[PDB]
Amino acid sequence: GSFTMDLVEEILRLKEERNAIILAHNYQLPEVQDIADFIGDSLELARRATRVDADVIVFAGVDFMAETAKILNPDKVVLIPSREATCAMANMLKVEHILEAKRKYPNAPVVLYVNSTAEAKAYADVTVTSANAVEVVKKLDSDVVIFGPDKNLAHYVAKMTGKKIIPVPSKGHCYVHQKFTLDDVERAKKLHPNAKLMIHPECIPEVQEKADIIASTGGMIKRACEWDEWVVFTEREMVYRLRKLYPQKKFYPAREDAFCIGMKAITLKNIYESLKDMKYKVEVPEEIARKARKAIERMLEMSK
């Protein structure tokens, strides 16, 4: 025929030529999810980064996720397709906040959400995601923990563990999940009265309290078998992921306008350019990476 390769076919060829794997988060654009080799939540992506056979990881996700992959694979090439694929919440936490909390509470473990810089993780005893924060905090040998950046996840963890949570920084939150309100709950239950509500713990507490399930995006997928219709209180591309996994169920976005700008910095074109030009190489200074790795490895040890 007269036709050549499209972007998809160019990516498939370059993935072979580079001996690469494409890891994608659940919030990636559908056409990006459709070319990824592995799709998952933050915890699943971290765990998958410990069994990489490929030489090159193309990370279709935000900065903190790609850096976590690099911390776990210091001697592989990790590429982020855009350096503007960033998490607003992760960048709210600075080392100075951690040091001030550690001064007040020297015996409190420092528990950092994976939404954090590698520099911040160098001061963590253990990392967590929304999938394992409760389990990890419950197991830590202290009735008080320093925890951040997300104050809404912190609220959920405090409620479920009964432990005292010292927030770092004071007001960390995700603007995407803050778009969900009680009015969205009322509208969803009116429009879809037979649906159950799956709600991310980055949503505000009063919205969390309306959930049928509170879960990470990975837990939403794991627990979707519990009902046939769901309203999805997280970033709207999760609806595509759930529909692909369970075509027989019904999924509805809680808000179509719940979009993560950083996630959508990743495009098919820049994934192609990432493989073609071997960019942008993610690097983490060795001293930071080794300390961060200790905290991430401990997380993986404490939650299977």
Contacting residues toward ligand SF4, per CB under 6 A: 62, 87-89, 115, 174, 176, 202, 235, 260, 262-263
In a 10 Å sphere around its CB, with 0-12 CB exposed, 13-18 middle and 19+ buried, how is residue 238 labelled? buried
Based on CB atoms, which residue is closest to ligand SF4, 145 or 176? 176
Smallest gap from Cβ 174 to ligand SF4, in A, equals 3
For residue 247, give both structure tokens.
């075509």
For residues 76 and 91, what is the distance between their CA atoms, to the nearest angstrom?
25
DSSP secondary structure string for all residues of 79-134: E-S-TT---TTGGG--HHHHHHHHHH-TTS-EEEESSS-HHHHTT-SEEE-TTTHH
- Count CA atoms closer than 13 A to 245's CA, side-chain side: 21
> Is 240 part of any known ligand binding site?
no
Based on CB atoms, which residue is closest to ligand SF4, 108 or 198? 198
Quick one: what does residue 204 bind among ligand SF4, Cl ion, none, with the CB cut-off 5 to 8 Å set by partner type? none
Smallest gap from Cβ 259 to ligand SF4, in A, equals 9
Strands (E), the chain: 20-25, 38-40, 56-60, 77-79, 110-113, 126-128, 144-148, 164-167, 196-199, 213-214, 229-233, 250-253
> Is 25 part of any known ligand binding site?
yes
Smallest gap from Cβ 16 to ligand SF4, in A, equals 30
Are 282 and 80 in contact by the 8 Å Cβ rule? The answer is yes
Quick one: what does residue 174 bind among Cl ion, ligand SF4, none, with the CB cut-off 5 to 8 Å set by partner type? ligand SF4
Smallest gap from Cβ 58 to Cl ion, in A, equals 11
> Is 202 part of any known ligand binding site?
yes
Quick one: what does residue 115 bind among Cl ion, ligand SF4, none, with the CB cut-off 5 to 8 Å set by partner type? ligand SF4
Quick one: what does residue 88 bind among ligand SF4, Cl ion, none, with the CB cut-off 5 to 8 Å set by partner type? ligand SF4
Quick one: what does residue 79 bind among ligand SF4, Cl ion, none, with the CB cut-off 5 to 8 Å set by partner type? none
Contact partners, residue 2, CB within 8 Å, separation at least 6: none
For residues 149 and 47, what is the distance between their CA atoms, to the nearest angstrom?
21
Selection from 203, 191, 255, 267 nearest residue 229 by Cα: 191
Smallest gap from Cβ 39 to ligand SF4, in A, equals 15
Smallest gap from Cβ 201 to ligand SF4, in A, equals 11
Q: Which residues bind Cl ion (CB under 5 A)?
A: 21, 52-54
Neighbours of 109 (CB within 10 A): 17
> Is 115 part of any known ligand binding site?
yes
Q: Binding site residues for [4Fe-4S] cluster, as ranges?
A: 87, 174, 260
Q: Binding site residues, as ranges?
A: 25, 42, 87, 113-115, 130, 174, 200-202, 217, 260
Q: Binding site residues for iminosuccinate, as ranges?
A: 25, 42, 113-115, 130, 200-202, 217
